[PDB]
Amino acid sequence: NAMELEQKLNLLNDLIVREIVNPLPPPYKVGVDLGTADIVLVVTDQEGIPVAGALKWASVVKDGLVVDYIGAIQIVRELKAKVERLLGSELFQAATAIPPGTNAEACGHVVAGAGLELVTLVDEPVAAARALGINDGIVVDIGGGTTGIAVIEKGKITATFDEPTGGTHLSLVLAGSYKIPFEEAETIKKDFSRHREIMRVVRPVIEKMALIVKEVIKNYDQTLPVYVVGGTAYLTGFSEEFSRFLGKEVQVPIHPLLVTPLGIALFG
Numbered sequence: 001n002a003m004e005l006e007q008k009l010n011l012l013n014d015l016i017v018r019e020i021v022n023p024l025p026p027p028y029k030v031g032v033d034l035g036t037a038d039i040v041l042v043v044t045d046q047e048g049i050p051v052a053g054a055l056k057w058a059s060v061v062k063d064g065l066v067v068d069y070i071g072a073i074q075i076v077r078e079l080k081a082k083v084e085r086l087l088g089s090e091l092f093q094a095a096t097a098i099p100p101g102t103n104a105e106a107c108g109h110v111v112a113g114a115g116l117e118l119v120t121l122v123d124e125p126v127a128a129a130r131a132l133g134i135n136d137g138i139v140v141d142i143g144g145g146t147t148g149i150a151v152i153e154k155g156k157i158t159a160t161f162d163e164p165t166g167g168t169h170l171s172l173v174l175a176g177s178y179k180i181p182f183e184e185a186e187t188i189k190k191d192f193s194r195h196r197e198i199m200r201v202v203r204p205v206i207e208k209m210a211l212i213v214k215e216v217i218k219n220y221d222q223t224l225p226v227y228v229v230g231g232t233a234y235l236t237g238f239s240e241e242f243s244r245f246l247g248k249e250v251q252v253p254i255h256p257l258l259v260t261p262l263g264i265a266l267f268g
């Protein structure tokens with residue numbers, strides 16, 4: 001599974017970034033991931049191999065309230081079309097995440113509103129999990145605006161949480177530290193050249209993050225493996241820095257940002 005997941009994520013990263021498709025024969029599965037910092041649309045064959053994907057940077061969830069619901073539909077619409085020109089065909093339906101911390105099924109309604117018959121809603125925990133293909137473990141989706149702890153065992157979301165921290169505080173904590181406009185700082189944070197030198201300054205937030213999880217795991221089985229996914233974990237060494245403050249080493253996959261999105265698509 002580790003090898004599989006890694007290869008699929010590297011693929012999906014290219015399908016997205018170099019805007020090309022994987023010419024697998026239909027039927028396809030589509031997934032839309034609604035989010036604090038980005039919207040992602042993902043297509044796969046019936047075995048979950050990536051076929052297509054697109055991503056827009058977009059704050060249409062602020063605190064879980066779809067605060068730009070129309071903006072959402074515009075984005076999903078523009079994504080659906082990009083993927084559609086790039087792919088042979090057109091798409092009819094998708095699964096979605098109703099992100100936790102949120103009357104937020106306007107989710108489905110963005111998907112329906114972009115012209116996709118809703119296949120189902122998913123919990124990000126459920127998705128995240130399936131993508132890792134991990135039955136028993138702990139998942140720490142560290143999104144842009146909230147993190148979202150969760151506990152699966154036997155093959156069930158046996159406990160779940162979430163707490164208003166993520167990539168943005170980092171970028172902000174950097175913005176503040178460096179004394180730089182927030183966009184200016186986000187452009188930096190994201191550049192891979194600078195992780196080395198942006199690290200020390202942004203470490204404090206990671207400490208905080210880890211100890212918050214430590215706490216929530218201070219009631220749950222320690223046998224449990226620990227998987228840190230989500231775009232915030234794109235910081236090189238994030239794995240290490242976090243693996244310390246928490247207490248146990250963590251697994252962060254090759255393209256952290258993509259894990260949930262790929263997972264949702266697995267439902268459609």
Ligand SMILES: Nc1ncnc2c1ncn2[C@@H]1O[C@H](COP(=O)(O)OP(=O)(O)OP(=O)(O)O)[C@@H](O)[C@H]1O
Pocket residue numbers: 033034035036037038039099124141142143144145166167168171189190191192229230231232233234235257260
């Ligand atoms: N190369 C990178 N280096 C550092 N951080 C990155 C990089 N690329 C993306 N990120 C960070 O990941 C965050 C967005 O992550 P993610 O896509 O998981 O969250 P979301 O879409 O807002 O919510 P969800 O977790 O449900 O997807 C942003 O803060 C972004 O800065």
